[PDB]
């Protein structure tokens, strides 16, 4: 479906971050789709992961 | 016929992710609420989300806020979880379940449960042995003989005998986890003594994750 | 992590075994609450401790 | 949050004995509290919800009761299938939690193991390791002493031990012990044994083989 500005940020946050592996980052878009209300706590976990990952 | 059925658990490495569906017949889960649900093994139920399709108010427990998300498509009755970030504890069989189905006020029914596991360890499928009966597995008119499966990553192995058709005196026991990291169990059953080579005993075994399936034919030596 | 055995003892023979587990002390309060709520439909209760406190017998007057 | 404190944690009872397992909400969650029983590698079947009405279906030695935060789970005359793990649940307040759980068990009769032993099949042997596998069946009480001998030498370290959940028709155990060798230690040694201890059993029982006898 479609998405406010503010989904559409959260989708390029996560499609940008450098050392996730292609399963994580489409997991977590998966997420942000499933979820909206979620969307804060998923980004912060996504960061977590390619942080630890770098 | 209210039914749940889990699927999509399977082995993933820490900080993988995986997709679980919840299949839901004979109700419309637009009625209810949908859980999921899970268990460490050998441990206690932990409740970790929980949806109402009819409006998609989602909660989570604090400790998968964020890693993991519920959801649901009323048009194929169907609810996920999509787990992120996964890590060692997040191991369990997952079960879903529905809530207020039919103004009842518990979860009145569970799926099967699915069992993801967590670790950097590889598949790998079984060895099967045969524990032949002898004269040292006999007593009383009686005799015991099993089947060894041996060696597999990870859980779960199901054994049946003589496919499903011999289910009397079978004692399969709980696998346990060798020093090498793999598992281990063997299946027993008794038999009368005088069926020893008239009658044919096999174990059939299958561990999906390696899609190793094993029909072994146990003799006297 | 303590694990306080207790043995039930009812009024009629019965004999029943339970098991409370937590900090002695948790596990202590534990087996006496239990008593207590056994005792309302089981008769007065006595508890003999043993082994430290880490054994009871528990009767039940019926 | 709110917690549920479940007691005791293992309770045994004899067939047709009354049993009651309790529960205790760390704050007032009206009769918002369910409960399930789970059996051996099954999934949780509710028995009693909303504190004390039961499922349809669910037999009528099981009823649940309410005072104040205190839950009670009873079973007027249990049966040998009533063995499992209980938990309760409450629904007053997000996050939905559960007791940890109480295992309830069957004393019945002592019943002394058939002990018997099984060598390394010659297939497993075609490879390097050697299983040797002790089965005890269908014994009571749980509590058994299983060592293992190789040439009348005492293992210590290289044995491990499954034991069944009680049988749900008649309350008994069964127990495996797998010594595990390399083929060349098997091939090294000539007699096996395996000796059992148990309740019932006048005295220990030996279960023995050498490598090689057909």
């Known amino acids: 479906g479609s998405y406010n500005k503010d989904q559409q940020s959260a989708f390029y946050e996560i499609l940008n971050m450098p050392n996730l592996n292609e399963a994580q980052r489409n997991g977590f878009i998966q997420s942000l789709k499933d979820d909206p209300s979620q969307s804060t706590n998923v980004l912060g976990e996504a960061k977590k992961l390619n942080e630890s990952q770098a | 016929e209210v039914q749940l059925v889990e699927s999509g658990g399977g082995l993933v490495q820490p900080g993988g992710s995986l997709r679980l569906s919840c299949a839901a017949s004979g109700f419309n889960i637009k009625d209810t609420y949908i859980h999921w649900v899970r268990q460490s093994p050998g441990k206690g139920l932990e409740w970790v989300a929980r949806?109402?399709?009819?409006?998609?108010?989602?909660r989570y427990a604090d400790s998968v806020k964020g890693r993991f998300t519920i959801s649901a498509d009323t048009s194929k009755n169907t609810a996920y979880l999509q787990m992120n970030s996964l890590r060692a504890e997040d191991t369990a069989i997952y079960y879903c379940?529905?809530?207020?189905?039919?103004?009842?006020?518990?979860?009145?029914?569970w799926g099967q449960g699915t069992l993801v596991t967590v670790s950097s360890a590889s598949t790998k499928g079984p060895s099967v042995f045969p524990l032949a009966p002898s004269s040292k597995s006999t007593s009383g008119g009686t005799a015991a003989l099993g089947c060894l499966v041996k060696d597999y990553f990870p859980e779960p192995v199901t054994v049946s005998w003589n496919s499903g058709a011999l289910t009397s005196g079978v004692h399969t026991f709980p696998a346990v986890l060798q020093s090498s990291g793999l598992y281990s169990l063997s299946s027993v059953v008794t038999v009368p003594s005088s069926s020893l080579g008239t009658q044919t005993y096999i174990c059939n075994v299958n561990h999906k994750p390696s899609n190793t399936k094993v029909d072994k034919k146990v003799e006297p030596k | 992590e303590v694990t306080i055995k207790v043995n039930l003892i009812f009024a009629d023979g019965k004999i029943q075994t339970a098991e409370f587990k937590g900090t002695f002390e948790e596990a202590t309060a534990e087996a006496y609450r239990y008593a207590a709520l056994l005792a309302k439909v089981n008769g007065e209760y006595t508890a003999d401790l043993e082994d430290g406190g880490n054994h009871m017998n528990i009767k039940f007057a019926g | 949050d709110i917690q549920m404190t479940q007691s005791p944690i293992l309770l045994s009872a004899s067939v047709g004995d009354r049993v009651t397992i309790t529960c205790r909400a760390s704050?007032?969650?009206?009769?918002?509290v369910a409960w399930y029983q789970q059996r051996t590698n099954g999934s949780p079947r509710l028995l009693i919800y909303?504190?004390?009405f039961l499922y349809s279906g669910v037999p009528s030695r099981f009823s649940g009761s309410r005072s104040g935060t205190d839950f009670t789970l009873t079973i007027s005359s249990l049966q040998p299938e009533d063995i499992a793990d209980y938990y309760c649940?409450?629904?007053?307040?997000?996050?939905?939690?559960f007791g940890a759980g109480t295992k309830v068990e069957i004393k019945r009769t002592v019943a002394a193991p058939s002990v018997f032993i099984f060598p390394p099949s010659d297939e497993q042997l075609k490879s390097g390791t050697a299983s040797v596998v002790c089965l005890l069946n269908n014994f009571y009480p749980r509590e058994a002493k299983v060592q293992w001998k190789v040439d009348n030498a005492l293992q210590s370290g290289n044995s491990q031990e499954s034991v069944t959940e009680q049988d749900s028709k008649d309350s008994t155990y069964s127990l495996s012990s797998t010594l595990t060798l390399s083929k060349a230690d098997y091939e090294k040694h000539k007699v096996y044994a395996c000796e059992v201890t148990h309740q019932g059993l006048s005295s220990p029982v030996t279960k023995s083989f050498n490598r090689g006898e057909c």
């Open positions: 649940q409450q629904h007053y307040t997000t996050p939905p939690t």
């Open positions: 704050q007032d969650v009206n009769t918002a």
């Open positions: 949806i109402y399709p009819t409006n998609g108010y989602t």
């Open positions: 379940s529905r809530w207020g189905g039919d103004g009842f006020y518990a979860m009145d029914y």
């Open positions: 909303s504190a004390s």
